[PDB]
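Handoff note, outgoing to incoming analyst
You'll be picking up this chain. Sequence as last confirmed:
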Amino acid sequence: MNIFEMLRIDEGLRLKIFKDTEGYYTIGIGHLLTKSPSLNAAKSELDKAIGRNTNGVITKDEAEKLFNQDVDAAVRGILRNAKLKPVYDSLDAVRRAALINMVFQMGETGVAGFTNSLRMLQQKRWDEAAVNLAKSRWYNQTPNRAKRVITTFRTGTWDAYK
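Most recent structure output, in case you need it:
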């Protein structure tokens, strides 16, 4: 198991524009296009992202390309954030992936806001961090995915993804 396989499990793959769990236009492996209600706006973002006139449909190879960029962007976001980087540096590789997963889903600024959870992770109080993380809109709106990510922080294993 690795962060790419983990996020493939959590995000799935669809090659046509659809709406994500929040109602936002999305494509590929959880690539958010826009928060705009306008499908036309979403299609324009897609065309810009891919570099061709797509009319809402991409190939698997194109999906995987956006995905590579998005995972890269999540790590880059963590390493450039003064709140996330110390926590990331303090973690083992498995828990690092859990943090990348959260940032992929909610963005750098969102995760950076989890001030008390981040401190517990930094302190390596895994059960306590896990309890704190579940007290969130994140957990309530996507509880099965949040449970997998939280279990990964709690245990430092891939048990929730096997």
